Subunit: 219 residues, 6 copies
Amino acid sequence: PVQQIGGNYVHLCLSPRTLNAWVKLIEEKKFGAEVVPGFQALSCGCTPYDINQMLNCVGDHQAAMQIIRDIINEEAADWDLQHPQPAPQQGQLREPSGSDIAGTTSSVDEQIQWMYRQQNPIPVGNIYRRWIQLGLQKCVRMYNPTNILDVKQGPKEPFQSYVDRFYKSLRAEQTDAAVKNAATQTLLIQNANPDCKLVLKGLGVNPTLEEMLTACQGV
Amino acid sequence: PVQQIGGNYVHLCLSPRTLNAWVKLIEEKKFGAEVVPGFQALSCGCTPYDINQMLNCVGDHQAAMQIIRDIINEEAADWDLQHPQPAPQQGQLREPSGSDIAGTTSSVDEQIQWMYRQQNPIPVGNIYRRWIQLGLQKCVRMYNPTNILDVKQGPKEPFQSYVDRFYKSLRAEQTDAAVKNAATQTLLIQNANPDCKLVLKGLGVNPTLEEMLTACQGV
Amino acid sequence: PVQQIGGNYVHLCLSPRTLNAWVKLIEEKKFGAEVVPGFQALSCGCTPYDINQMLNCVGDHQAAMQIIRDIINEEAADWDLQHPQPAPQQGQLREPSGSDIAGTTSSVDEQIQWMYRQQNPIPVGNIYRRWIQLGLQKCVRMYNPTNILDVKQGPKEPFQSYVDRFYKSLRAEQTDAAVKNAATQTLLIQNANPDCKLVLKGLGVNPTLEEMLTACQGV
Amino acid sequence: PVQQIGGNYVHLCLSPRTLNAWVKLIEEKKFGAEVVPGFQALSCGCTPYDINQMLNCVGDHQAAMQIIRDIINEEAADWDLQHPQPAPQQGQLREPSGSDIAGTTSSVDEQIQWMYRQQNPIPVGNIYRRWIQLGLQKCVRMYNPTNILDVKQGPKEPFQSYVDRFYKSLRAEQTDAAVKNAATQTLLIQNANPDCKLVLKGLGVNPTLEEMLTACQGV
Amino acid sequence: PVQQIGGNYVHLCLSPRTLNAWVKLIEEKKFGAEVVPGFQALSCGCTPYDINQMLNCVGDHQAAMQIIRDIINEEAADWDLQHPQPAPQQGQLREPSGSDIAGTTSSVDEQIQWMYRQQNPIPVGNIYRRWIQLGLQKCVRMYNPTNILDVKQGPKEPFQSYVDRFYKSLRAEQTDAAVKNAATQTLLIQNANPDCKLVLKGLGVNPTLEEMLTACQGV
Amino acid sequence: PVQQIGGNYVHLCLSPRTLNAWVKLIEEKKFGAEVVPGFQALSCGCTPYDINQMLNCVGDHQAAMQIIRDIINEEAADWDLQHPQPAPQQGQLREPSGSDIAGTTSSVDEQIQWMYRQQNPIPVGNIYRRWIQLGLQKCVRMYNPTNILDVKQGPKEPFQSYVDRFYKSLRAEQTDAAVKNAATQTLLIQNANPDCKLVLKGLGVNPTLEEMLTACQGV
């Protein structure tokens, strides 16, 4: 992270506690949806230099890390098109390229200068965090064990259990379309078992989740 | 959370310790009544941005999380009726809608501005915490294994044990009516076993819990 | 707890560490005598708002929690008799009732005002802690497995072991009378086994614990 | 402990970490010699109020705690003889009795006043810590499994092992006399086995421990 | 590390937490690629004196530690050639040799002087960290269980699994050449099994990792 | 440790965390070479008073602790010869003897005065740490399971494994002579098995460790 000592902004060492919590999250949860807000929280206040330490401390899951790296490169390339950089005049620090934001071609002090300079500050750490989020969302989709369309209530599975599996798989899609609404509720009802579906059909148009759970308790 | 640096209020990163304690509470306790004060303590001093990280780090129990989301939307809609928002004049920050308080349509800095502005501060974090409490109370009711009306003392169950189960289920109702008083004490006596009920009938009108426990010890 | 920021006293969030230590104490020790100083230490510097979070985070043992609640109400009622409260003149904060000290009818900021106001400060947090101590002492008596009068040395039980059990049960009474003195020492000797009692009778009037342990070692 | 806020000395809450470490030390080590420096370290900077919380959080070993209490009373009585206290003139805080130093008849604020007053400060916390040390030393002797005089080298026990047991039991005496010197070394040699004793006799007068260990390696 | 007290820079004790995390990393991960960023993070802000404590606390793996020591000596010798040091005039601190940067011939205070002196500061801690990184990279290669050229997809091994093993071994090379590009992708395809290779051949020139994983899912 | 409050240097309580880490190091690692830098790190910034708490908290291994005590006494005696102390004139604090540096005849405040006095400060804590290091080095030699001269490669033991054992035993000597150089490398080659020795003989004069490991891989 960053700290202020005197009238200057200087690197603050990344906590080993934070670093270890990130490493444990990956080892234990293996790209469940919670990895996305997990990274956001644990990378809060970080420079790209700090973020790369977090990512490089992951010892396994290298296919997923490579996918993340590929998404970082796409966004880095897109950045260069949206913000081409004229050659720094008079020995002044350049404007950051995509690789600079990713921390591959920039130092910690350069990153801090862009982040905390008075005129036209660029939050390169927070931009890089956004790129990694997109990569992690691809990984959640990749590691999802059961696609939403294959979530079907078992003959004797409690309705509450089926609903848990349904919304977990729906969330694992990681898209704006895969959210609770009339269209996704239609699928939920459709893929319920015959006994529960018969009960759900009697609840009218667009019943609430609470109504559905109440009505199907014990069926 | 929030911190003061100079004469400005700025985001303070949420502690990984706090975040992990919340995640563990859900995984281990699974919506027992203690989840309500647990959230209150662990979300103390938080902005809606921080609170959403807490809620989104929950990997399972998505039916319950959806119920919470539904209650948040109801309260968000109710807020818009009670406090409609005129269009911000002169490039000034708008007054917050329900979605702004929930952190879905607002940034961390907007949340902090509403919370710490001099004129007419709005504690959007604490309002959002109240909405989530209502959602968690619904979940406690949902996860309650034994309804209060089905708590009946076994033939040879110690009276103290039965009382523990009774007040645990009573509390799990999460209502103003489900509290120790003459009416709920009447049910407690009613659903005691024949041996203990005979002893309790001799203690007069409205005996104290201590009197009931003393009188029934060993029966 | 409370903190000073500028010239104002404001709420300080309760540590999750402290909260978890309290919850673990109850789960693991189950109202052994150490629960009383345990609460005192862990509730140090707390407002009634903070204390209620501690108490409400207890998920089981609800008979005991209800006993505590009953003692709180008795002391709250007693407070209202000793300190009736005239109606606040001129929009000034009222003087606290029993329910205000218990945190049921007061906010955190009201509690802090009473605690840190210049004229006639009232330590409502420390008063409430005293009420809860009385409740916890009742619970220690309730959970005590062996009454002091039933602690009798076994035929071949080492004297040191018997003494441990005796003073543990004596302490579990939680009264001023149940303390080491000539009267309770008389019971200790009385309930020793024939072999140790014969040795203890030869030590004169009011022998010390060290003398008793030395004399009975190996008997 | 104590802290300075403004120009005043005020109580600092005892850390739950410290308190728990003390409780665990007793439960796990059960009055081995290390309990004495352990208490000293963990009670560093404490008032008698804080120290009593530490001691009262011990749930078992009440014979030992009573022995400690008896030693505290002896030292408290001795204090009253060495420093009788005239009656406080003019509503000024009294000079502390033995019971005041022990924290039984004094509050935290009285303890802090004696500790940090300008004229004739009395470190009541550190005096009380000395009294408890004397009590803990008695307990180490009591819990010692093998008296020094019964530590004898086995027929085939390695000399290094025997030496470990010897100095552990010697230390457990907790006296000035029970220390490594010519007299205690004479006993060590005396209670070695015939094979090692023959080797030790050839090392001259007052051989060093290193010489003894070197000479007996493998015998 | 270093701290400022008054107008002077003084040693800050290395945290036991950090030290223990380093020791555990070596014991548990045994020179997997993550040891390199792990050292970088855990040695952040350290002087050579602090770094040597970290390295010397490693109790096993002494062949690897000797390899690190050999690389340190090479870089130390190279430093002396690039920056020969004239004899300090007038009792002034010398310019640092290679052994001074390694902390073998310099004290903590000398290291801090070079690091924080106004004119021509030399970051000896960060230079030494670079030397150790080179040593750790050699160790990663040494401990790598499967050379990249021996990573071949099994008859029925899922393509995702094979890809994980491939990029883990590729990374374990620790060279600029061993990175995802057209040349290394050619090897990945080449060493896939007949069923997956047939599918991969139909994806055109330089297919993306995502395309390869999508195309081979379930083959 | 020490802290500055106002214009005065005062004792800072030793952290229970640090103390516990030292105790665990001894219990778990039992005088492996890492105990030496371990003590150095964990005793950083300590007074002799603090160091004695660390050493006295060790409950077992008393032969080793006595060896340490014997080395402390030798160095203490040597100090008195090198720095005899004239009698303090005019009620001024004496110059420290060997026993004062060891903390046996001095208080914490005396130790701090010597450490932080303006004229002729004496770092008694750091001098004492040096004495204990010498004692711990003797203990490492004592606890070493396999003497360097008895480390011989097994018929089918991998060369890397043999090298680990060799350098671990070499280091356990704790002398300037027992370091990697031409002479100790000669022994390493000499005590390799016939198959590896034949390979090593072909590598010329003074081959590097890397060359030896590369050449012998799989033999």
